[PDB]
Write an enzyme that holds these catalytic residues in place. Structure first.
Site, PDB file in Angstrom:
ATOM      1  CG  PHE A   1      -0.245   0.124   2.555  1.00 29.40           C
ATOM      2  CD1 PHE A   1       0.002   1.389   3.133  1.00 29.40           C
ATOM      3  CD2 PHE A   1       0.257  -1.018   3.187  1.00 29.40           C
ATOM      4  CE1 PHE A   1       0.712   1.502   4.317  1.00 29.40           C
ATOM      5  CE2 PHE A   1       0.945  -0.908   4.364  1.00 29.40           C
ATOM      6  CZ  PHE A   1       1.170   0.367   4.932  1.00 29.40           C
TER       7      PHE A   1
ATOM      8  CG  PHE B   1       3.862   5.826  -0.098  1.00 31.84           C
ATOM      9  CD1 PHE B   1       3.169   6.949   0.359  1.00 31.84           C
ATOM     10  CD2 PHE B   1       3.848   5.541  -1.466  1.00 31.84           C
ATOM     11  CE1 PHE B   1       2.522   7.791  -0.541  1.00 31.84           C
ATOM     12  CE2 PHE B   1       3.218   6.388  -2.352  1.00 31.84           C
ATOM     13  CZ  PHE B   1       2.562   7.518  -1.893  1.00 31.84           C
TER      14      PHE B   1
HETATM   15 CU1  CUA Z   1       4.743   1.517  -3.971  1.00 36.31          CU
HETATM   16 CU2  CUA Z   1       6.367   2.582  -5.748  1.00 36.31          CU
END
Ligand code: CUA
Ligand code: HAS
Ligand code: HEM
Ligand SMILES: CCCCCCCC/C=C\CCCCCCCC(=O)OC[C@H](O)CO
Ligand SMILES: CCCCCCCC/C=C\CCCCCCCC(=O)OC[C@H](O)CO
Ligand SMILES: CCCCCCCC/C=C\CCCCCCCC(=O)OC[C@H](O)CO
Ligand SMILES: CCCCCCCC/C=C\CCCCCCCC(=O)OC[C@H](O)CO
Ligand SMILES: CCCCCCCC/C=C\CCCCCCCC(=O)OC[C@H](O)CO
Ligand SMILES: CCCCCCCC/C=C\CCCCCCCC(=O)OC[C@H](O)CO
Ligand SMILES: CCCCCCCC/C=C\CCCCCCCC(=O)OC[C@H](O)CO
Ligand SMILES: CCCCCCCC/C=C\CCCCCCCC(=O)OC[C@H](O)CO
Ligand SMILES: CCCCCCCC/C=C\CCCCCCCC(=O)OC[C@H](O)CO
Ligand SMILES: CCCCCCCC/C=C\CCCCCCCC(=O)OC[C@H](O)CO
Ligand SMILES: CCCCCCCC/C=C\CCCCCCCC(=O)OC[C@H](O)CO
Ligand SMILES: CCCCCCCC/C=C\CCCCCCCC(=O)OC[C@H](O)CO
Ligand SMILES: CCCCCCCC/C=C\CCCCCCCC(=O)OC[C@H](O)CO
Ligand SMILES: CCCCCCCC/C=C\CCCCCCCC(=O)OC[C@H](O)CO
Ligand SMILES: CCCCCCCC/C=C\CCCCCCCC(=O)OC[C@H](O)CO
Ligand SMILES: [O-][O-]
Ligand SMILES: [Cu+2]
EC number: 7.1.1.9
Lengths: 166, 32, 554
Positions: A84, A86
């Site tokens: 996802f 980050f």
């Molecule tokens: Cu997650 Cu690039």
């Protein structure tokens, strides 16, 4: 001279075209070999497995990262990974060495990469679909997951971890 | 007679292909 | 100028080239910055002072990709593969259509440029859903691409008109190249047209909530592979039909050149899954098939390598070169129009070698989405294609404008061509190597400066290439504007013949040329192979669509 040059050029070209075809055929045969061995586990299961990226964090096997590692065989574990923005859950992923690991990775938001440094695991993760790949970790320790598909401004800093225990 | 220059060129091309391919294939197995 | 009254095609061609080159220059500005980034040096704060609309590395990367790899290369293709057949047949293209094609490109570009410049479409030149750009990006991109359809009609028009005037004659070489090229492009284009029309446009307009990421990627790469050959073939048309003359020799085989092109028509589209080796929901057996076909699509270039090499040798032997190295020095190394494509062909050796690795299915898990890919394709498009386009400045520009090329400008052309070439070679080492060290592509790595310490050595090559390429670019900007904005004009240059090569003596295979000339039959075969290579997978996907909401993460 010109007439001779042209016959000679065309004759050798044919030789070259045959050799090149051979080399390419050999590569085809050397690839087919990889398909026959355990190293092919990194090839995605090309089976469609739809999921709903909007509820994937609320209900289902991706909802509780601490229960994402399930023993599914005598020497097999399945991991429910969420890539996802980050990051990755669980963090870390904890698997035993010598065990066959079936990674089941999906995304809530956008597309991410799942590239396990040191290994052949390298798979696009698509929201709405489950990516399935298999790997057996032969050496214990700490492997880094890199996101190698642009996913927005947080891309360059998106990393995860796999801990392979003895 | 024979196009020796052309052959030299496809020689370099073959070797480059081979080094690249065999190189990566070794890498693939090392990471297997 | 009365030369434009008799050959209005020159003026249209000119407009395609300049717009193409302008798009190359603007796109290329972000390049040295990206190269220094992969060298772990952050020069972006400097770039944001000079260009304040630039909000991120990724906006720059988007502009760089769209402007260099999409816009310039297409404008060059439309320039080359319309005007060259036009001159070979000595016929006028439909001038209303040719102009309509230019405006479409220009309008499509402007409209797409607006959201790109305003940071509303930082999605990259692949624009993968669910990353959701502004509707004007998709619309502008679509109208820009569709411009090629009008180009397709133009060459088919010229070809049919010629065949009517000349029944029982085979298609001339350059025209044969262009016809199979454009018909290849039509089949190839459908993947992206379908993707825009069915999915991306309505989605960007609000008409649907989501898009299925897998189907979009699959339709994208339908067009996505053959677009690479769409960039390449125009350079090949020059390399085959002009470069032999420039080098002091002749084309050694007309039939072999046709065969290569025919192979590209057949094999350029049914291969897209080689961009999808790491995608879920696509059956492995299909990935294997595409992999095999991709290896086949390498055959036309392996063939090219020999035909061209032998043509270069023949020229060098004609100019007095002896032994097996002497024919190389015997070639016109003072002529940038010869040098630029030959250097590009040189770098194409490792370039195509890296492509053969990528096509190898499992071997792609090694390099997929790493710096390797950029390392590979800069050899192909940023070098061989771009260079061949740069080298045509020295023959085509004067043919289209009557503007002379001075000795000084020629010497500057040499410097540009070499420095670009060498910069690309150096960057190629840095990116392939870093790629092998697991450095990801499309990443602002300089902003995570302790993330890839093992890449310290290849990083130094990246910084070097960055600065070398900046200088090449500055010299190119200066050099291009010095010729475009030169005072003197000499209409006798604009009325001179294009330096089309002659074909060497020795009987061809008449039967094969005639077989290859059955173009409708080969187009249908090409279409069938695409139905066989994509039909089953696409039928399965469309039956099982799972559309997901879009995101903006910039
Ligand atoms: Cu997650 Cu690039
Ligand atoms: C115009 C540009 C392009 C060409 C052409 C090109 C050719 C190849 N490619 Fe590629 N490539 C792939 C495989 C191939 C194959 C097998 C070849 C082949 O067609 C190449 C065959 C060529 C040769 C066998 C070389 C022959 C050499 C010649 C002809 C020169 C001879 C020298 C002479 C004659 C001069 C000598 C003279 C003297 C004086 C000595 C695959 C995978 O299977 C991927 C995805 C990888 C991944 O994981 O993402 C990929 C990705 C890319 C991308 C990135 C897409 C993205 O953004 O995600 C781009 C832009 C690109 C461009 C281009 N590509 N490629
Ligand atoms: C002055 C020369 C240029 C330099 C220094 C250079 C540098 C770079 C580098 C370092 C990257 C990778 C960035 C990343 O992965 O984050 C890149 C991306 C790219 N470049 Fe260039 N480049 C140049 C010119 C060109 C040209 C002429 C083309 C082809 C026409 C082009 C096409 C590409 C494309 C298509 C991308 C991929 C964009 C993406 O992944 O979205 N480059 N270049
Ligand atoms: C592992 C091997 C690595 C080593 C590199 C291989 C060399 C590469 C290409 C040779 C291609 C040319 C094949 C020669 C064809 C011979 C031919 O056709 O010659 C006709 C002539 O009439 C006879 O007198
Ligand atoms: C004119 C002569 C015609 C003859 C030409 C024949 C081509 C020979 C080339 C390659 C052999 C392929 C060998 C396949 C075996 C691969 C085994 C391997 O690489 O093993 C990896 C790893 O050790 C497993 O875990
Ligand atoms: C001109 C080009 C120069 C070519 C130069 C290429 C250099 C890279 C070669 C092989 C990388 C192989 C990748 C295998 C990585 C093994 C490292 C490793 O074992 O790291 C993870 C482990 O978990 C730690 O505990
Ligand atoms: C123009 C630019 C030129 C591009 C440079 C890339 C050239 C060759 C790739 C060969 C692959 C590198 C092989 C090194 C790794 C190796 O030898 O593999 C076994 C090792 O154990 C693994 O960890
Ligand atoms: C949006 C308007 C597009 C404006 C397009 C104007 C077309 C002008 C053009 O290039 O066509 C020649 C014309 O007949 C004039 O001389
Ligand atoms: C250039 C073309 C640009 C696209 C604009 C109009 C195309 C027509 C779109 C047709 C309407 C689709 C809306 C629809 O039926 O949506 C399905 C919905 O998700 C189920 O409830
Ligand atoms: C041709 C000129 C204009 C076309 C009109 C296009 C105007 C479309 C506006 C719709 C829009 O912007 O909708 C965004 C929506 O909220 C999704 O995120
Ligand atoms: C035109 C050429 C057509 C000839 C193409 C060859 C396709 C044949 C078999 C593919 C075998 C696919 C096996 C991959 C599955 C491995 C797996 O399940 O990995 C986990
Ligand atoms: C990594 C960066 C290193 C770069 C590696 C790429 C190869 C470099 C140059 C091409 C060599 C081909 C030979 C071309 C030389 C020109 C020539 O032979 O000219 C001599 C003289 O002018 C008579 O006319
Ligand atoms: C025009 C001419 C074009 C041709 C030029 C292209 C060069 C191709 C390959 C370079 C070979 C690279 C050397 C191989 C590296 C292997 C190595 O040292 O491996 C790393 C080690 O295993 C990890 O510790
Ligand atoms: C040793 C380490 C290497 C560091 C790399 C340095 C990079 C560039 C130097 C400048 C290169 C400029 C080459 C110009 C060649 C040229 O323009 O000459 C035309 C030639 O006569 C036939 O075309
Ligand atoms: C064309 C010649 C280009 C570059 C010279 C090669 C540069 C290689 C020097 C590597 C320097 C470096 O970064 O050092 C490694 C590491 O930091 C140790 O602590
Ligand atoms: C005119 C001919 C000149 C051609 C030059 C020869 C090529 C070699 C080096 C220059 C490369 C410049 C790179 C210097 C950047 C320093 C750097 O980034 O290195 C950091 C260090 O390795 C970690 O702390
Ligand atoms: C035209 C082609 C021209 C090619 C010339 C190559 C560039 C100069 C190299 C000499 C070495 C200069 C070394 C300068 C110090 C580098 C350094 O210390 O790096 C800067 C800093 O660390 C980063 O932020
Ligand atoms: C639609 C055009 C695709 C078909 C091209 C083949 C074709 O029409 O061939 C006959 C020609 O019109 C007469 O010479
Ligand atoms: O894809 O080349
Ligand atoms: Cu491709």
């Amino acid at each position: 001279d010109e007439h001779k040059a042209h016959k000679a050029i065309l004759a050798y070209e044919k030789g070259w075209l045959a050799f090149s075809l051979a080399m390419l055929f050999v590569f085809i045969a050397l690839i087919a070999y990889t398909l026959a061995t355990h190293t092919a586990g990194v090839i995605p299961a090309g089976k469609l497995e739809r999921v709903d990226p909007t509820t994937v964090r609320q209900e289902g096997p991706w909802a509780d990262p601490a229960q994402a590692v399930v023993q599914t065989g005598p020497n097999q574990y399945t991991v429910y990974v969420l890539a996802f923005a980050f990051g990755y859950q669980p963090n870390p992923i904890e698997v035993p060495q010598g065990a066959e690991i079936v990674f089941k990775i999906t995304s809530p938001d956008v597309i991410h990469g799942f590239h396990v440094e040191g290994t052949n695991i390298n798979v696009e993760v698509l929201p709405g679909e489950v990516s399935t790949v298999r790997y057996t970790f032969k050496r214990p320790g700490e492997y880094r997951i890199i996101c190698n598909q642009y996913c927005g401004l947080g891309h360059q800093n998106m990393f995860g971890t796999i801990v392979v225990k003895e | 007679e024979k196009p020796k220059g052309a052959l030299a060129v496809i020689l370099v091309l073959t070797l480059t292909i081979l080094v690249f391919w065999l190189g990566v294939y070794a890498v693939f197995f090392a990471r297997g | 100028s009365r030369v434009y009254e008799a050959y209005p095609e020159k003026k249209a061609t000119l407009y395609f080239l300049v717009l193409g080159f302008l798009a190359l220059i603007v796109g290329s500005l972000f390049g040295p910055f990206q190269a220094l980034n992969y060298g772990n040096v952050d020069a972006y704060p400097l770039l944001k002072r000079l260009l304040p609309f630039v909000q991120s590395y990724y906006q720059g990367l988007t502009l760089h990709g769209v402007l260099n790899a999409i816009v310039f290369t297409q404008l060059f293709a439309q320039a080359i593969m319309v005007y060259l057949p036009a001159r070979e047949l000595n016929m006028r293209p439909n001038m209303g259509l040719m102009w309509l094609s230019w405006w479409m490109a220009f309008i499509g570009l402007v409209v797409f440029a607006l959201p790109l410049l305003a940071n509303e479409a930082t999605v990259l030149y692949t624009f993968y859903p669910p990353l959701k750009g502004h509707w004007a990006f998709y619309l502008g991109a679509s109208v820009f691409v569709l411009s090629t359809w009008v180009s397709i009609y133009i060459v088919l028009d010229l070809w049919r008109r010629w065949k009517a005037a000349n029944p029982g004659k085979v298609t001339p070489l350059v025209t044969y190249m262009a016809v199979v090229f454009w018909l290849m492009w039509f089949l190839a284009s459908l993947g992206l047209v379908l993707e825009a029309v069915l999915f991306l446009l309505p989605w960007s307009f609000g008409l649907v909530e989501g898009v299925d990421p897998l189907v979009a990627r699959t339709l994208f790469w339908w067009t996505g592979h053959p677009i690479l050959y769409f960039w390449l073939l125009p350079a090949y048309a020059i390399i085959y039909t002009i470069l032999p003359k420039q080098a002091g020799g002749k084309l050694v085989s007309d039939p072999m050149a046709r065969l290569a092109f025919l192979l590209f028509l057949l094999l350029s589209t049914p291969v897209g899954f080689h961009h999808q080796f790491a995608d879920p929901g696509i059956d492995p057996t299909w990935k294997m098939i595409h992999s095999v076909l991709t290896l086949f699509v390498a055959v036309p270039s392996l063939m090219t390598a020999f035909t061209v090499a032998a043509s270069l040798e023949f020229a060098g032997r004609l100019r007095g070169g002896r032994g097996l190295f002497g024919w190389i020095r015997a070639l016109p190394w003072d002529n940038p129009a010869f040098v630029a494509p030959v250097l590009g062909l040189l770098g194409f050796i490792p370039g195509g070698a890296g492509g053969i690795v990528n096509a190898s299915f499992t071997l792609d898990y090694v390099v997929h989405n790493t710096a390797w890919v950029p390392g590979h394709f800069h050899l192909q498009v940023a070098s061989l294609v771009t260079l061949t386009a740069m080298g045509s400045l020295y023959w085509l520009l004067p043919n289209l404008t009557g503007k002379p090329i001075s000795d000084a400008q020629r010497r500057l052309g040499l410097a540009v061509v070499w420095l670009w070439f060498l910069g690309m070679m150096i960057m190629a080492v840095g990116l392939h190597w870093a790629g092998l060290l697991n450095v990801p592509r499309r990443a602002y790595i300089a902003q995570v400066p302790d993330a890839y310490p093992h890449a310290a050595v290849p990083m130094v090559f990246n910084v070097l290439a960055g600065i070398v390429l900046l200088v090449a670019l500055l010299l190119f900007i200066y050099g291009l504007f010095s010729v475009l904005l030169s005072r003197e004009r000499k209409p006798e240059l604009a009325e001179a013949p294009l330096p089309f090569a002659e074909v060497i003596s020795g009987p061809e295979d008449r039967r094969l040329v005639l077989a290859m000339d059955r173009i409708g039959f080969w187009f249908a075969v090409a279409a069938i192979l695409v139905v066989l290579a994509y039909g089953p997978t696409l039928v399965q996907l469309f039956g099982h669509l799972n559309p997901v909401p879009g995101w903006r993460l910039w």
